Swiss-Prot record:
This is T-box transcription factor T. The gene is TBXT. It is linked to Neural tube defects: Congenital malformations of the central nervous system and adjacent structures related to defective neural tube closure during the first trimester of pregnancy. Failure of neural tube closure can occur at any level of the embryonic axis. Common NTD forms include anencephaly, myelomeningocele and spina bifida, which result from the failure of fusion in the cranial and spinal region of the neural tube. NTDs have a multifactorial etiology encompassing both genetic and environmental components. Chordoma: Rare, clinically malignant tumors derived from notochordal remnants. They occur along the length of the spinal axis, predominantly in the sphenooccipital, vertebral and sacrococcygeal regions. They are characterized by slow growth, local destruction of bone, extension into adjacent soft tissues and rarely, distant metastatic spread. Residues 11-171 bind DNA. The chain holds residues 41 to 211 of 435 of the full protein. It is found in: Nucleus. It comes from Homo sapiens. The lineage of its organism: Eukaryota, Metazoa, Chordata, Craniata, Vertebrata. Involved in the transcriptional regulation of genes required for mesoderm formation and differentiation. Binds to a palindromic T site 5'-TTCACACCTAGGTGTGAA-3' DNA sequence and activates gene transcription when bound to such a site. Detected in testis, but not in other, normal tissues. Detected in lung tumors (at protein level).
Length: 171
């Protein structure tokens, strides 16, 4: 059985219990913490690409009001985010299972941009998601996994100083 697990969930849960925020810039900002995934149960000899996208967790705009995050009243449909290909893709099952798959080079932006960067809506809440795509073989297959622990609101600057402090303490 293909098992997908979150590396350093202890640290993510510190961020989650304060409401995590991720900076987005015109040029794109790398994530901290970085999404690292533990993968077992692949065919060491089969070929796979690892894909990362961000699901809008709800249809609302959020705002930091009197030291607390609160959803707007006026939901709108949120089109799904573009997908980021892990730069080691495509690769053998063995490659992916020998160490945590680290999405350290993904950059989050608020502007439609050349390429690489993933555009998110500022003040929307996001749930990171990966797709493991078996490629090259005859039988294409996809396995998807969500990481609730890694939820965040996309912000152009930190609102909760407790988050600012955690980001620095653990970088
Ligand atoms: C030209 C460049 C953008 N390539 C597109 C395909 N790609 C993959 O690893 C994928 C395979 C199956 C689904 S995605 C990365 C390399």
């Amino acid at each position: 059985e293909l098992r997908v697990g979150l590396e350093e969930s202890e640290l993510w849960l510190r961020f989650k219990e304060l409401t995590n925020e991720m900076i987005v810039t015109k040029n794109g900002r790398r994530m901290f913490p970085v999404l690292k995934v533990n993968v077992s149960g692949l065919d060491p000899n089969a070929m796979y690409s690892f894909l990362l996208d961000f699901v809008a967790a709800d249809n609302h705009r959020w705002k930091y009001v009197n030291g607390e995050w609160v959803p707007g009243g006026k939901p709108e449909p949120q089109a799904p985010s573009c997908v980021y290909i892990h730069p080691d893709s495509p690769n053998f099952g063995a490659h992916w299972m020998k160490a945590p798959v680290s999405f350290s080079k993904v950059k989050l932006t608020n502007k439609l941009n050349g390429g690489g960067q993933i555009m998110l809506n500022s003040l929307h809440k996001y749930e990171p998601r990966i797709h493991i795509v078996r490629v090259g073989g005859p039988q294409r297959m996809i396995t998807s996994h969500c990481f609730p622990e890694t939820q965040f609101i996309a912000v152009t600057a930190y609102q909760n100083e407790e988050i600012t402090a955690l980001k620095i303490k653990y970088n």
